[PDB]
Curated annotation (Swiss-Prot), chain A:
UniProt cross-references to CDD domains, sorted A to Z: Ribosomal_L29_HIP
Entry superkingdom: Bacteria
Subunit architecture: Part of the 50S ribosomal subunit.
Record NCBIfam families: L29
GO molecular function: structural constituent of ribosome
HAMAP family listed in its UniProt record: Ribosomal_uL29
Name of the protein this chain belongs to: Large ribosomal subunit protein uL29
UniProt keyword list: Ribonucleoprotein, Ribosomal protein
UniProt key word Ribosomal protein: yes
Family: Belongs to the universal ribosomal protein uL29 family.
Entry's Gene Ontology cellular component terms: cytosolic large ribosomal subunit
Swiss-Prot record, chain B:
SUPFAM superfamilies found in the cross-reference section: Translation proteins SH3-like domain (SSF50104)
Function of the molecule: One of two assembly initiator proteins, it binds directly to the 5'-end of the 23S rRNA, where it nucleates assembly of the 50S subunit.
Signal sequence bounds: none
SMART domains linked: KOW
Name of the gene encoding the protein in the UniProt record: rplX
This protein's name: Large ribosomal subunit protein uL24
Annotated Gene Ontology cellular component terms: cytosolic large ribosomal subunit; nucleoid
Subcellular location(s) per record: Cytoplasm; Cytoplasm, Nucleoid
Assembly: Part of the 50S ribosomal subunit.
A UniProt-annotated Pfam family: KOW
Family, as annotated: Belongs to the universal ribosomal protein uL24 family.
GO terms, molecular function: DNA binding; rRNA binding; structural constituent of ribosome
Major place of residence: cytoplasm
UniProtKB/Swiss-Prot annotation, chain C:
Gene Ontology terms for molecular function: structural constituent of ribosome
Source organism: Bacillus subtilis (strain 168)
GO cellular component: ribonucleoprotein complex; ribosome
Disulfide bonds: none
Upper taxonomic lineage: Bacteria, Bacillati, Bacillota, Bacilli, Bacillales
Swiss-Prot/TrEMBL keywords: Ribonucleoprotein, Ribosomal protein
Record note on quaternary structure: Part of the 50S ribosomal subunit.
Descriptive protein name: Large ribosomal subunit protein bL28
NCBIfam families: L28 (TIGR00009)
Example GO BP: translation
From Swiss-Prot, chain D:
Biological process according to GO: translation
Domain of life, per lineage: Bacteria
Keyword rRNA-binding in annotation: yes
Disulfide bridge positions per record: none
Keywords tagged on the record: Ribonucleoprotein, Ribosomal protein, RNA-binding, rRNA-binding
Pfam families for this protein: Ribosomal_L23
Gene: rplW
The protein, known as: Large ribosomal subunit protein uL23
Primary role: One of the early assembly proteins it binds 23S rRNA. One of the proteins that surrounds the polypeptide exit tunnel on the outside of the ribosome. Forms the main docking site for trigger factor binding to the ribosome.
Subunit (UniProt): Part of the 50S ribosomal subunit. Contacts protein L29, and trigger factor when it is bound to the ribosome.
Length: 65, 101, 58, 90
RNA sequence: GAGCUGUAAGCAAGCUUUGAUCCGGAGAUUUCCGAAUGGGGAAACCCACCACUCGUAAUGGAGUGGUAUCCAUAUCUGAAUUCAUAGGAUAUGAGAAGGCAGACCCGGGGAACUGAAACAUCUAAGUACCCGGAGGAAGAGAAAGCAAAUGCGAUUCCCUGAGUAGCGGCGAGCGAAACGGGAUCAGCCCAAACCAAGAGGCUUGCCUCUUGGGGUUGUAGGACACUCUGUACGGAGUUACAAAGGAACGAGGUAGAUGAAGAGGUCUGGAAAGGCCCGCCAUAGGAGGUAACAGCCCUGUAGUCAAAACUUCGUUCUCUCCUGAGUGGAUCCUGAGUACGGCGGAACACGUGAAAUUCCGUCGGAAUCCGGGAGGACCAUCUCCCAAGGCUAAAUACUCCCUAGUGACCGAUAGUGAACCAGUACCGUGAGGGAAAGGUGAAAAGCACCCCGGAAGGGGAGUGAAAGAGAUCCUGAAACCGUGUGC
RNA sequence: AUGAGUAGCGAAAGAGGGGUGAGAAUCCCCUCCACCGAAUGCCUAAGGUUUCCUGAGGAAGGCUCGUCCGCUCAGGGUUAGUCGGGACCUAAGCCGAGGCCGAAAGGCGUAGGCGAUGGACAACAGGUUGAUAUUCCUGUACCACCUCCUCACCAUUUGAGC
RNA sequence: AGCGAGGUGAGAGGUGCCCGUACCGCAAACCGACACAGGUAGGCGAGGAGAGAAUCCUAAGGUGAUCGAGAGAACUCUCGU
């Protein structure tokens, strides 16, 4: 994915993806706490995805400086 | 490990000498390997869910690789392993020959 | 507590009575508090007489 | 900061059932947050208004596993009272 | 280069040759407390101000960043007081704070027990301990020396000298140095006269205040006057000798790769690494593991190779900076409240003794080259040397740590207190004290099923070489506990 | 191990019937009786830190038993503008810029600030579950603050108002 | 004093954060090594007789107390004659 997010745009596109994934994760945690859920790998996946999606931003800023 | 899953390996020691079989699974942290038709031990299982009848199943146990060796693809004879490059990537190669695997 | 000029201090040592009985003591200093400027600021600071002799300002 | 990060998860008990019958729901929350934060969080997420909020915080139950006797994590649960003329939630 | 989502069995969900997991380098994130630093604070909590942003009809609420003290620098103010100063205000600072490894060292303070067969001098001991500073080493260090010969030439450390000389209620005890032999080597700056420039004060041509050059020494040297000389030809360098950097190359470290030779046969055995008979490799017979003792089974070893990136050293180059020889003997300079002395103390092996030497405190107090200091009181001669200013690597000390590897070192009451979730449990208000506790089996193959029983626990069966191996699980003694029985 | 199945089993009225259960003096229910009653009752601090409630269990602990619990497992449970405390005040005491002393360390101490056991300060009366409640629900109120708004009044430099 | 071009008052509408809130609390949860005859600040504190929070018996309300039954001897203790 690295190349994908490094292709995408820093502030608007990528942050939109961030908040979208965070909404997803939120719903995941509710489904889990309720017991309506099966695929638990999604949670780890999404959290890691947000991490990469944020650190690309951080390196773009430090590249700016 | 000098061995992979999905081989045609030969046994060396144990009760099941003079024996051949493929591999069902490996375990590098333990240096152990499963083999079809080898060390087929009996396990006493209780009538618990996902076969709630229990009974005495019979299944292969692991063994240590050092008591196992692969085969010359040519002669079907036991060989030791070296490694060689062809087109980049390394490959297993059998002494007694320069034959792969 | 020390001379600003020299850095004299209240040093330590012994007191050997007749029969050389030893006891700890200090030799202080003849510091005197006098009005004098460090850089500016006439400061009213300690300084020793052994410094003050031979013409330093007060 | 985000409301999604504010809220953590709900609490499914017969108490919570009895309360969502009476329109007031419950949650559990990060320990630092406060009543107004969670209120605006709900309003921003579910698009629903609020009558009031009542908030709590529990300590960590000690436990035992073999010799090992650690402590459970703390909890900050929050009861929110929807208005009438307000939506419900899944 | 194929399993992997740890301990940890596991079901679930899932990822991986479009190359994961894993390993290594460089980075990113890095809640709160803590030097803790916005303020406060009973540790990990609370309460704010300023800007900006989110949000509110508005407050209310949230987020990001900053906001301590001290020090230095610069600027603006610059009171009583007129200048002016204090003090205040602001901006910059990878400043410094605090920690440590319970070790090494430098210093300031500085015990007692004890020994002396008591004991005060003395010892123990400048130890322990406290405090402040450090550095990877520190400290010392280029002669106001050792000494007493056709003289040695910085310090440090080692062996000797030597338990000598000597000190000492001449008691107990303390205890050198030099010579010599060795490890390592290294030498250099400054103040000062003098000159050039600048500034203020007018001490009105004197002044120190600054910058630069100059010069650094003892059979005296330097300034000053003369000649000679050189300005990068060459030379020295960031370890001192001035400081700051860059490249290239070589080697090495931080992940790794390769890597010879037998399932040789046969006998036991549950299983061969073992026995017997045979072969082979070796720059590899080091180690560990594998169902028992393995050079030829595995990982590996010897040997040979390897690094994108970060690092250590070395070489070269760039880069920087560079002057030094002699003769003169008018005059000038060569470290001032020090050098010494008296009085008190201390350190010197050396306890005030005849007490040199060094240092501290007070008081006094000098010459300054026709000069001055030491050579164990002191004087003369002679010899050696120029203090009061500074820098200087190596040889030396130690190891929290890391890597690799050794032991006529321990093997679970031992050895670290600690082989196991230990500085834990536990004790104590607190500092602080401080344990116990290893072993199934090669492998869970860990006991399906039948009975007794509410269970636990048993008896069978089954697995296994072994169940008398069954979860305190190798052996399993003795004390102690019982059953039966010959006399 | 002995002592020795010995001492002790920690003040105080229990009895019976039913029930549960493998199993009951000891657990549950009922009925009587008895004890406390300026206390053995209700509130509430400090302190403890899940002991609370429910349902399972009875290996250990309970000075016996145990079907039981302040024990073990699971789960659950503690709702505040007005209560108590902070965003308010200060005493004693403590810290303490600068400063004063002092071998060092540090001590003292101003300004300033912490600091309740006191001062000031707006909400009560009824229900409510197995466990919370002047916190939840129902009624009725109060305090402080804000203006997208409505109204009344006053005044823009003697200019009302704070 | 100072700030002062928009204020004052009333109404309507609206906002109102953090910690604690369970349970024991003369007790088997606290301090006493114990489910220990001890200690544990404070508020409420009934009725008859009664001066009275004494004392006796009782309310509200709470307990029947973590080994028992059975004989009823010497001896010990606490008691009564």
């Amino acid at each position: 994915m690295k190349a994908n997010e490094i292709r995408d745009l820093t502030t608007a596109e990528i942050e939109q993806k961030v908040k979208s994934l965070k909404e997803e994760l939120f719903n995941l945690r509710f489904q889990l706490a309720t017991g309506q859920l099966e695929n638990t790998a999604r949670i780890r996946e999404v959290r890691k995805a947000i991490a990469r999606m944020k650190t690309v931003i951080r390196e773009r800023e430090i590249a700016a400086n | 490990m000098h061995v992979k899953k999905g081989d045609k390996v030969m046994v060396i020691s144990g009760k099941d000498k003079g024996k051949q079989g493929t591999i069902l699974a490996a375990f590098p942290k333990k240096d152990r390997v499963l083999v079809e038709g080898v060390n087929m031990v009996k396990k006493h299982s209780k009538p618990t869910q996902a076969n709630p009848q229990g009974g005495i199943s019979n299944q292969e146990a692991p063994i240590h690789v050092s008591n196992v060796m692969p085969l010359d693809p040519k002669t079907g004879e036991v060989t030791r392993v070296g490694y060689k490059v062809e087109d980049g990537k390394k490959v297993r190669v059998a002494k007694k020959s320069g034959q792969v695997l | 507590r020390k001379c600003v000029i020299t850095g004299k201090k209240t040093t330590a040592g012994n007191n050997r009575s007749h029969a050389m009985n030893a006891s700890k003591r200090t030799w202080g200093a003849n510091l005197q508090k006098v009005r004098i400027l460090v850089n500016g600021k006439p400061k009213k600071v300690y300084v020793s007489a052994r410094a003050l002799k031979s013409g330093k300002v007060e | 900061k985000d409301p999604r990060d504010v809220l953590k998860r709900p609490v499914i008990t017969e108490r919570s059932a009895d309360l969502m019958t009476e329109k007031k729901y419950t949650f559990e929350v990060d320990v630092r947050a406060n009543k107004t934060e969670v209120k605006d969080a709900v309003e921003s997420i579910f698009g629903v208004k609020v009558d009031k909020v009542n908030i709590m915080n529990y300590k960590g139950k000690s436990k035992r596993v073999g010799r090992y006797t650690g402590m459970t994590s703390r909890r900050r649960k929050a009861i929110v009272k929807l208005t009438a003329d307000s939506k419900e939630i899944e």
